[PDB]
């Protein structure tokens, strides 16, 4: 069977500047080799067919060169809305095989983040759990650490967190952590903060909240 | 871009010689098929190899073709004395996709028949009645060379010559060794006003020398 | 007088494989030791008959399929096998009785700016039956609503044309094929 | 009115079977090349198998023998047939209108076929209050604990889109997803606008509203 | 037999016109493609034009592009190369050669080769016009066998033949091939080695003669005193 390998696996660039990636082939697969765009949670689209022919309605910016096992994908000049996964298939001989994916991401300016924290609600509470949620929102770039703190002891092991795909306006990231424990474990301390340090931050900024305050 | 081809091969009779014929992106790099021709000296080319290789009906097997990337080969198994002729490689050009063919530089392939064989030379002063016209040509005629290849330098009291000069290409004689003749053209105020004059011919690393008085 | 073998192997031209062409072979004898003895044929595998054994064989009739294809597709001139050559193009029967010969024809079928004019048919509606040669160039209607001759969205020319660069791989270059049907008896050993 | 309607994928115990139908409109399943594609959580995407015009059916290997494709002239559907399905089949199943030519490419949205043993848990759906910094406020809802994916949250019926963020959802220690999705409102509009977050759970068959509103005593 | 018979070459002065005519037979004409090739003298090959089975499209190379126009008529089954404005560097042997076959041929014709060449048909371009050859005598030495010979200097055009004591001569006798002086004119010597003894007792007359001049000269070579 075939198999599609596609460089880079992930890519950063600034708004306007020209990004390629690479798709090469293991076998001789002429020409028959489309690319898709799948913005998060969509499904794929089709942006170029047959290595070099661009589907109806992609914008001009959208290029496709190579022949034989080396195929090249390039954008002119990069847009905030081109953020997603970009994917390379052959299709004429089976089975149909597709490339690893190139995650698309833009280099905007620095941002700080919003930062907010939310109390487990009475509602949860009893149920014998709690979840103090963090919020990072709108920031750049996405390193970003967050650091519980629990009558200012350091927590780690109990909160996950999660965050968002570039916003495709303003190209920016947002975080939630969320730190889990029991009401017992909840009603057994008073002060409850997260501490955020980050890149566009001259020093780490701390939301907190006292418990039945 | 135009193809490239060895000036000269040269082998011994019952040996094996190959001629190379290296293009571009847009002629054998781009896949497209190389013939190659023969042309005896004042004849026409004959077809030897055509679609890289297959021979055409009546070329001996001898000769056999190939071609690899962005280069095709002619191979002359066994060379006969018949095979010293000009071989040439021919393919077409993709620069703009239309109908434009390309051939090579020729090569030159010399069958090693005899021994090597040292020229005589015979230098003859300008005439007085060449003088007379306001002219003067110093004839400098060479013969029985093998191989045809010659070096001629002039000298004018040891100080070389660098103008006024003009040589034949050596052409095979009935003997098949080879014959030239080469010519410096002259003022009869340079004739006279030097003491001596010389043409330097090189064979095969050896030099032969003649020189005339203006007496 | 003998069979004439040498019209189809060694044609000038080739019938592209949606109109494939084909040959009678009647009144004449043949030798088939020559055809297995070349080894210039990179596929030569016969059904229900031995290559060697075939000189002491009397048919009725030997019918004579060849056209071009694409070495990827060689794979599917044989019985039982699907694809969009042996489903709309050429379709082998399950009790083939014959031989299926094919080589490599990239010098000959494969232009520089590309051979264009070898075509395969790509949609059908339904596969073709055994030794069916359909060579309609009616516009498919893959849609809800009909054509009429219009060819555009929903509404395809069926036919589509090889793309064959002397620069493609071996699966893409193109191969001629010839197959044998072997059917008062008139073509011997 | 060209587009790919798909439906019928759960949760299913491993080993068991399910099938997955795809509508069409604006074009005849029956006379196209049709074509089923997976793609992992967080992973790349699969070939699955083919149906060709004339009817023949080609298969990946590693669904061969246990996956069937097949179609329905009459309500022109496509169909995906899933037998003995594993922990590895559990993904996203896009049907698609196999590209052939310009522009017949067309894909569905997919659904999420999951392949697990534990049950189905409707989420709990709790209140992110909002706090007090002067011109801007920040608001939510958790979803906590359900099982399998996925959830659909939004807010207002839909009449709220501008600031909203959805994060992904977790897998908490206990294998239930956790998820919270919050909005950034101004925080004049606090004590007039009402902020209701709609959840949805289609393996459960929940559908919660809940009202968000300020903290006080 | 295939055959190509190509015609119509001569001298003529730069920037004039010239039309040369390709004769075949053997072959079905109206198929096959056909093409120009030059050959200078001592250089090798140059493709000029080709023009297919119709003559819808021609191609040309870039040094005649424009100067030069190629057309058939299949009707006599000739070739034809129409030269204009002519230039000192299309000075060459030119050769007809058939192409591939478009209409009933192999579909890649780029397989198949110039296999029929024809005669070659011969091209020179200048401005000197004619002109005789002044002869010289290139006198023996006297010194302690000898040679002695002729110096036909600057003419135009080729050829001259030289023969010796009007033809009785023939022993020892050696006529080089003329050069090309940067002039235009055409210098050529030819010597005869004789024995010493015989230089005072025996006549020597090299007898040059010029066609295109309408000149015979006949020169008497005798030692020096
Ligand atoms: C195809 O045609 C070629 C001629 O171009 C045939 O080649 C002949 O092959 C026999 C032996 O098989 C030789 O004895 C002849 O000398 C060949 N002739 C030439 C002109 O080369 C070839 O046999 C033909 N093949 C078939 C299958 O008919």
Same mark, same amino acid.
């Given at each position: 069977?075939?198999?599609?390998?596609?460089?880079?696996?992930?890519?950063?660039?600034?708004?306007?500047?020209?990004?390629?990636?690479?798709?090469?082939?293991?076998?001789?697969?002429?020409?028959?080799?489309?690319?898709?765009?799948?913005?998060?949670?969509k499904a794929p689209k089709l942006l170029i067919y047959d290595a070099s022919n661009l589907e109806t309605g992609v914008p001009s910016r959208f290029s496709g060169s190579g022949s034989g096992t080396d195929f090249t994908f390039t954008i002119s000049s990069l847009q905030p809305e081109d953020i997603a996964t970009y994917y390379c298939q052959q299709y004429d001989n089976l089975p149909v095989t597709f490339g690893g994916g190139?995650?698309?991401?833009?280099?905007?300016?620095?941002?700080?983040?919003?930062?907010?924290?939310?109390?487990?609600?009475?509602?949860?509470?009893?149920?014998?759990?709690?979840?103090?949620?963090?919020?990072?929102?709108?920031?750049?770039?996405?390193?970003?650490?967050?650091?519980?703190?629990?009558?200012?002891?350091?927590?780690?092991?109990?909160?996950?967190?999660?965050?968002?795909?570039?916003?495709?306006?303003?190209?920016?990231?947002?975080?939630?952590?969320?730190?889990?424990?029991?009401?017992?474990?909840?009603?057994?301390?008073?002060?409850?903060?997260?501490?955020?340090?980050?890149?566009?931050?001259?020093?780490?900024?701390?939301?907190?909240?006292?418990?039945?305050? | 871009?135009?193809?490239?081809? /060895?000036?000269?091969?040269?082998?011994? /009779?019952?040996?094996?010689?190959?001629?190379?014929?290296?293009?571009?992106?847009?002629?054998?790099?781009?896949?497209?098929?190389?013939?190659?021709?023969?042309?005896?000296?004042?004849?026409?080319?004959?077809?030897?190899?055509?679609?890289? &290789?297959?021979?055409?009906?009546?070329? /001996?097997?001898?000769?056999?073709?190939?071609?690899?990337?962005?280069?095709?080969?002619?191979?002359?198994?066994?060379?006969?004395?018949?095979?010293?002729?000009?071989?040439?490689?021919?393919?077409?050009? &993709?620069?703009?996709?239309?109908?434009?063919?390309?051939?090579?530089?020729?090569?030159?392939?010399?069958?090693?028949?005899?021994?090597?064989?040292?020229?005589?030379?015979?230098?003859?002063?300008?005439?007085?009645?060449?003088?007379?016209?306001?002219?003067?040509?110093?004839?400098?005629?060479? &013969?029985?060379f093998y191989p045809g290849a010659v070096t001629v330098a002039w000298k004018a009291d040891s100080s070389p010559v660098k103008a006024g000069v003009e040589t034949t290409t050596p052409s095979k004689q009935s003997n098949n060794k080879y014959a030239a003749s080469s010519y410096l053209s002259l003022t009869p105020e340079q004739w006279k006003s030097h003491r001596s004059y010389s043409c330097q011919v090189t064979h095969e690393?050896?030099?032969?020398?003649?020189?005339?008085? /203006?007496? | 007088?003998?069979? @004439?073998?040498?019209?189809?192997?060694?044609?000038?031209?080739?019938?592209?494989?949606?109109?494939?062409?084909?040959?009678?072979?009647?009144?004449?004898?043949?030798?088939?030791?020559?055809?297995?003895?070349?080894?210039?044929?990179?596929?030569?595998?016969?059904?229900?008959?031995? @290559?060697?054994?075939?000189?002491?064989?009397?048919?009725?009739?030997?019918?004579?399929?060849?056209?071009?294809?694409?070495?990827?597709?060689?794979?599917?001139?044989?019985?039982?096998?699907?694809?969009?050559?042996?489903?709309?193009?050429?379709?082998?029967?399950?009790?083939?009785?014959?031989?299926?010969?094919?080589?490599?024809?990239?010098?000959?079928?494969?232009?520089?700016?590309?051979?264009?004019? #070898?075509? #395969?048919?790509?949609?059908?509606?339904?596969?073709?039956? @055994?030794?069916?040669?359909?060579?309609?160039?009616?516009? #498919?209607?893959?849609?809800?609503?009909?054509?009429?001759?219009?060819?555009?969205?929903?509404?395809?020319?069926?036919?589509?044309?090889?793309?064959?660069?002397?620069?493609?791989?071996?699966?893409?270059?193109?191969?001629?094929?010839?197959?044998?049907?072997?059917?008062?008896?008139?073509?011997?050993? | 009115?060209?587009?790919?309607?798909?439906?019928?994928?759960?949760?299913?115990?491993?080993?068991?079977?399910?099938?997955?139908?795809?509508?069409?409109?604006?074009?005849?399943?029956?006379?196209?090349?049709?074509?089923?594609?997976?793609?992992?959580?967080?992973?790349?995407?699969?070939?699955?198998?083919?149906?060709?015009?004339?009817?023949?059916?080609?298969?990946?290997?590693?669904?061969?023998?246990?996956?069937?494709?097949?179609?329905?002239?009459?309500? *022109?559907?496509?169909?995906?047939?899933?037998?003995?399905?594993?922990?590895?089949?559990?993904?996203?199943?896009?049907?698609?209108?196999?590209?052939?030519?310009?522009?017949? *490419?067309?894909?569905?949205?997919?659904?999420?076929?999951?392949?697990?043993?534990?049950?189905?848990?409707?989420?709990?759906?709790?209140?992110?209050?909002?706090?007090?910094?002067?011109?801007?406020?920040?608001?939510?809802?958790?979803?906590?604990?359900?099982?399998?994916?996925?959830?659909?949250?939004?807010? *207002?019926?839909?009449?709220?889109?501008?600031?909203?963020?959805?994060?992904?959802?977790?897998?908490?220690?206990?294998?239930?997803?956790?998820?919270?999705?919050?909005?950034?409102?101004?925080?004049?509009?606090?004590?007039?606008?009402?902020?209701?977050?709609?959840?949805?759970?289609?393996?459960?068959?929940?559908?919660?509203?809940?009202?968000?509103?300020?903290?006080?005593?």
């Open positions: 069977a075939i198999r599609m390998t596609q460089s880079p696996s992930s890519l950063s660039a600034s708004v306007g500047d020209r990004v390629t990636i690479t798709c090469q082939a293991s076998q001789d697969i002429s020409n028959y080799l489309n690319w898709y765009q799948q913005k998060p949670g190139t995650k698309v991401d833009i280099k905007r300016t620095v941002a700080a983040p919003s930062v907010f924290i939310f109390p487990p609600s009475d509602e949860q509470l009893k149920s014998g759990t709690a979840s103090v949620v963090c919020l990072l929102n709108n920031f750049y770039p996405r390193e970003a650490k967050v650091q519980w703190k629990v009558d200012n002891a350091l927590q780690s092991g109990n909160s996950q967190e999660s965050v968002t795909e570039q916003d495709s306006k303003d190209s920016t990231y947002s975080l939630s952590s969320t730190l889990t424990l029991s009401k017992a474990d909840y009603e057994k301390h008073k002060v409850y903060a997260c501490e955020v340090t980050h890149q566009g931050l001259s020093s780490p900024v701390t939301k907190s909240f006292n418990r039945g305050e | 871009s135009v193809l490239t081809q /060895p000036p000269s091969v040269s082998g011994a /009779p019952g040996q094996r010689v190959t001629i190379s014929c290296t293009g571009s992106s847009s002629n054998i790099g781009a896949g497209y098929d190389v013939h190659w021709y023969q042309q005896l000296p004042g004849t026409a080319p004959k077809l030897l190899i055509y679609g890289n &290789s297959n021979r055409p009906s009546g070329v /001996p097997d001898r000769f056999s073709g190939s071609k690899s990337g962005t280069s095709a080969s002619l191979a002359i198994t066994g060379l006969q004395a018949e095979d010293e002729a000009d071989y040439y490689c021919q393919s077409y050009d &993709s620069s703009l996709s239309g109908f434009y063919v390309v051939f090579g530089g020729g090569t030159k392939l010399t069958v090693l028949g005899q021994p090597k064989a040292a020229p005589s030379v015979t230098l003859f002063p300008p005439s007085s009645e060449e003088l007379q016209a306001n002219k003067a040509t110093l004839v400098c005629l060479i &013969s029985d690393g050896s030099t032969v020398e003649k020189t005339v008085a /203006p007496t | 007088n003998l069979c @004439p073998f040498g019209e189809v192997f060694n044609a000038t031209r080739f019938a592209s494989v949606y109109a494939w062409n084909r040959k009678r072979i009647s009144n004449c004898v043949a030798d088939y030791s020559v055809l297995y003895n070349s080894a210039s044929f990179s596929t030569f595998k016969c059904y229900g008959v031995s @290559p060697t054994k075939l000189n002491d064989l009397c048919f009725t009739n030997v019918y004579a399929d060849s056209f071009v294809i694409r070495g990827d597709e060689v794979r599917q001139i044989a019985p039982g096998q699907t694809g969009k050559i042996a489903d709309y193009n050429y379709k082998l029967p399950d009790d083939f009785t014959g031989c299926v010969i094919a080589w490599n024809s990239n010098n000959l079928d494969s232009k520089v700016g590309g051979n264009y004019n #070898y075509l #395969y048919r790509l949609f059908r509606k339904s596969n073709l039956k @055994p030794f069916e040669r359909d060579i309609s160039t009616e516009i #498919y209607q893959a849609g809800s609503t009909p054509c009429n001759g219009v060819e555009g969205f929903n509404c395809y020319f069926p036919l589509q044309s090889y793309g064959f660069q002397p620069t493609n791989g071996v699966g893409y270059q193109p191969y001629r094929v010839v197959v044998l049907s072997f059917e008062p008896a008139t073509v011997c050993g | 009115e060209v587009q790919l309607l798909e439906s019928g994928g759960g949760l299913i115990q491993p080993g068991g079977s399910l099938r997955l139908s795809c509508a069409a409109s604006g074009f005849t399943v029956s006379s196209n090349y049709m074509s089923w594609v997976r793609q992992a959580p967080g992973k790349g995407l699969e070939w699955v198998s083919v149906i060709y015009s004339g009817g023949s059916t080609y298969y990946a290997d590693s669904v061969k023998g246990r996956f069937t494709i097949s179609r329905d002239n009459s309500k *022109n559907t496509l169909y995906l047939q899933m037998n003995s399905l594993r922990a590895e089949d559990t993904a996203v199943y896009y049907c698609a209108r196999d590209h052939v030519r310009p522009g017949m *490419n067309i894909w569905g949205q997919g659904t999420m076929v999951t392949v697990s043993s534990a049950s189905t848990k409707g989420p709990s759906v709790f209140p992110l209050a909002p706090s007090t910094s002067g011109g801007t406020a920040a608001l939510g809802c958790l979803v906590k604990d359900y099982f399998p994916e996925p959830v659909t949250v939004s807010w *207002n019926s839909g009449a709220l889109t501008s600031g909203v963020h959805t994060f992904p959802a977790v897998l908490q220690s206990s294998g239930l997803y956790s998820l919270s999705s919050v909005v950034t409102v101004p925080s004049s509009s606090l004590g007039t606008q009402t902020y209701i977050c709609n959840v949805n759970h289609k393996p459960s068959n929940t559908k919660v509203d809940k009202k968000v509103e300020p903290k006080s005593c």
